[PDB]
Amino acid sequence: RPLAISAPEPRSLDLIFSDEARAALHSKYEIVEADPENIAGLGDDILGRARYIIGQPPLSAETLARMPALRSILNVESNLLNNMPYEVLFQRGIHVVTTGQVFAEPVAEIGLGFALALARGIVDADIAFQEGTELWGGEGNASARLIAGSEIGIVGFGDLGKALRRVLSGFRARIRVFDPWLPRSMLEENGVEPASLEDVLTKSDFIFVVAAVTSEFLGAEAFSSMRRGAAFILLSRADVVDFDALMAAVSSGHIVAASDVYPEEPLPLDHPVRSLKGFIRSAHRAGALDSAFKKMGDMVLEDMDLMDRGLPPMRCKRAERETV
Amino acid sequence: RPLAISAPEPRSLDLIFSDEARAALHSKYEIVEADPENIAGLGDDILGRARYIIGQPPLSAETLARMPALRSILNVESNLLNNMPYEVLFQRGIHVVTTGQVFAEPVAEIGLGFALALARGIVDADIAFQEGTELWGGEGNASARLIAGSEIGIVGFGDLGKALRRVLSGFRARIRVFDPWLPRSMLEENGVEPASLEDVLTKSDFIFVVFLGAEAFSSMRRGAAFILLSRADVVDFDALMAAVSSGHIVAASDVYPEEPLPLDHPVRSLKGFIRSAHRAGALDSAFKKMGDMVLEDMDLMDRGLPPMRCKRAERETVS
Amino acid sequence: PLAISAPEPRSLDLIFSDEARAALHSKYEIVEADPEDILGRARYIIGQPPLSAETLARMPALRSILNVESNLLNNMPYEVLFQRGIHVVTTGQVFAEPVAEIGLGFALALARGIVDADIAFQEGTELWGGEGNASARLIAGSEIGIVGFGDLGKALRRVLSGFRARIRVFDPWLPRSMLEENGVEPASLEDVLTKSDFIFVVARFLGAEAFSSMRRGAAFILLSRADVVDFDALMAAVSSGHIVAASDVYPEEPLPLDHPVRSLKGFIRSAHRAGALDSAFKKMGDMVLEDMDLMDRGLPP
Amino acid sequence: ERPLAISAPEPRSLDLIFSDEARAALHSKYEIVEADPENIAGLGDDILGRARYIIGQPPLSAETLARMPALRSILNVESNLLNNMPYEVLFQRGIHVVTTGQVFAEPVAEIGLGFALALARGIVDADIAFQEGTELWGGEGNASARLIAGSEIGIVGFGDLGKALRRVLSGFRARIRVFDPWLPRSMLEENGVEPASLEDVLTKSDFIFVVFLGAEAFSSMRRGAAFILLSRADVVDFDALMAAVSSGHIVAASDVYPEEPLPLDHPVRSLKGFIRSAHRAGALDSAFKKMGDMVLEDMDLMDRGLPPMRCKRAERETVSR
């Protein structure tokens, strides 16, 4: 049986493997749990045979020079880490794979969720009824509106982009996407209309922010640029918008909105965002679902099985061209 | 040009018509507004020749035999009314048409809204965030799940079910449907999987309804979602309520037994429930369609064409 | 349970599978009649009789009429059926799928010279490249036109799903709204003929005027009913290299052994065989059977 | 000074793979040097030292490669890697080799579905019958004539071609089983297919597109099964296939063959139940044009320093194999 070192922290085997998957995994491999701060500490025997690393440990040239069978490192924190001589793991042919796309479907779903909540006031309609201020249907629907309509714009488009395009595929709506690093040919074939940020921002009833582009726009001036009763949905990275610029457009009652991410987390208790009518709130929980984490396990398993049978990993994301 | 009685019920011509289809109507038809409850007392020059009624007005045989012209009654209130002689219309060959399909999309749409909200605690995540109650990231999500790859069951299958099917498209869920009337082999070529009411209840994470209750609520899954969208008469409402209060299930409704509802009613106090004041279908875009749906049918029957557009009413006279 | 079986032209041996007659016996029972105890109590009817205003009043316990030969074999007591109540429906929809599939078939072959490249290969004269593909084009993203849109149009539209094309349909009967939600763009006949790369004909004369109107590379597929087509004009259009075409139906079926189409380069011929599949007849049973088990529940079909 | 690319596309050409709009963009944005594929070494040091891309598949030596410090990628326009390079020293330098083969998936898939309906329904024969006069009219003709709609379909392989084959089959709502052991089963499933063992595909499918395999393979298929072979004859026992076809066990269609061009002698030229195609499934002009368009899309990404995305990337293990 091939040997794999486990050093998944701050993730863990218990979290990322269903029973079925965990049994499959140990039935198939010797999985030695190991201290990530001390990989070098392992058996000079253990290091000689390791074909895989599940996780993201610190590593150095000398300890890496000790691992002649290492085939791949499977990153399970969604994020690449300035952690080890990537140059030599490239020289050697050693793939580094990531499992972050597990968080797409979770985030799409709750994302379409807010879209429908805003476009029909599902929340305000529940609180009003809850305490007792109806408007009994028809009378509620001043500002109601279908998504099937309908002009959708996506700011960014990676995995979260695609997951969203998928859930929306039942709405026969119009989907404008802005993305710098995807050719117009690839967008068109993903079922979307490649577009300027200004088109997306402007000719759109529903706007989703979904990926950074990059590193770090959309301020007071970007918001006014919108259509009147516009739906603006923030799913990734709060640092890209001016929050108070955004709140301003909401109280003003220009656009309507919902975010899952905030300029500070957790947000202080006194913070304005809490009282603002017309803004749906979500405590950075769009992606952390158990089943998302159990999927990481499945992926790892698929990718191991390919590399065991000599083939390149397919399932988790590869890395290459990223100095940082 | 030809003649049409305009007597819609709570629906007015204003509401169910955009300027476009409105101005195209007298432009195309001689149309006369008329008290819907006094339709016999319209001028007999009129009765004898008018060929379409746009409304749901009550009609007696006497008022009927004086409409030899009349080829269809076009109803703009979704549900057929025990209102007239539905036996003469048949011989006379008169069509009664329904425009009720226009509530399929908006209800589907808001149905997916509840499910995702039920599935993910959207509403009580928000209410909490108002009040400072919180729980960030993974702490809030103990019983938050995906709909994609989940098991959905529908009860009945209207236009509403076809509309629900369509919106679910991108979820790749297992769609079990239970519906007596429509032949087993017609759901198959419509996307969904035919199934006994048992499975639809016992083996669905999400159950949509488009008589029953109590034991049924106990036969449902671990922490499954009930989403109720039409015909309140079918659920024992207290049985649902306790089934919700127990914690055994989570639920959402757009229909209620007393409508409007008592201000005392305890549902409004009820954790694990999401309320809507019958607002699933009542959308201006929905209303405006009825109009165009009507014109299309009129124009069609003018050629003398058995209309395809609106819904018809065959052996559903028995009820 | 009672039903009347005047199948001919169609059999019962051949419009039901095993499980399908197996079930029709053990849930009903039936006759070996002649479309030209009984009279009164009869609930159903699997046939195409002219029977017959008098013989009708004699059958007062009737529910539904089941034409198992697509077309309505008139005459029934036309008005004393809708005034009386009894039900009139067809099985004709089973032919939709088979016609569609083979329609796409002809399209692809016209689109890529499949038949010509198999003949060439046989006769030793095939171009390999590259070089064999000068007129080869792709159906994907390509502007297809349909003329008519019955049960048939629908099936076509469905086998086309995965092609990603702009589909234009000319149909005066169906209201714009029904087509557009049904996945197609509604259009005027000119805007079809003139603006399509592949035109399919499904359901008083289409002639020389039209064929000149079509785009120069265009492909003309004829699937139902010759009558509305100027057969001569069609043959001149193809003959001149203006268009390529294909047709399952002809001015006269069978067609004379000496008919100039039998040797017209650019034209794919099929002998009125779009719809006649064994599986379509077997689906006929299912259809009537399921809709019987519905009628005897006070429900429509 | 604009980035320089070396063009050596033979057996293809710039005239063929670039359309007008695209060929102009290419020379606006790039300094394209046309080279003789057998002599890249001879180009100036001035060119070799400044070159950033190669369009085509020229034989290259570590020797030459060493003289190319700026080389970012080799954009291979024949669809197939050649063993004419030190693949070790690429990779090393992070020089990408990409492939333009995806332009074939769509044309190959349409003709593939076109071969299946031909088989399913005797389109070729029926036309030939009408030509000659012999001649069955609708019903007696369709004795051995099925739908694809309800059927069970099977795919051996699944790259771009499978995907395109899955797209065009989507209107038919069939059950599609596919064997691809280079894809993880989750990736198959999200692509709308049911992953399946080789022998299930072989034994449980009314239609089999190929996208080992000899007499036991053929004898295991269901009795009326159609077998559509679209890529690389390399993997069928062509003699067994013909035997299987002539006995009336299966009907079949191929666009590829054991020697190409075939000899005029060849048995498969006279064989019934076989639809023939002269390796033309994928060579359409519009297809060759799409290579120019991809090549340019990828050169753009790399000028911006991103990795390639529109063309497929040569992986150490493929080049190993």
UniProtKB/TrEMBL annotation, chain D:
Entry annotated with the keyword Oxidoreductase: yes
A Pfam family reported for this protein in Swiss-Prot or TrEMBL: 2-Hacid_dh_C
Keywords, alphabetical: NAD, Oxidoreductase, Plasmid
D-isomer specific 2-hydroxyacid dehydrogenase NAD-binding domain span: 114-281
UniProt xrefs under InterPro entries: D-isomer_2-hydroxyacid_DH, D-isomer_DH_NAD-bd, NAD(P)-bd_dom_sf
Lineage top rank: taxon: Bacteria
Gene Ontology MF, one: NAD binding
SUPFAM superfamilies documented for this protein: Formate/glycerate dehydrogenase catalytic domain-like, NAD(P)-binding Rossmann-fold domains
UniProt protein name: Probable phosphoglycerate oxidoreductase protein
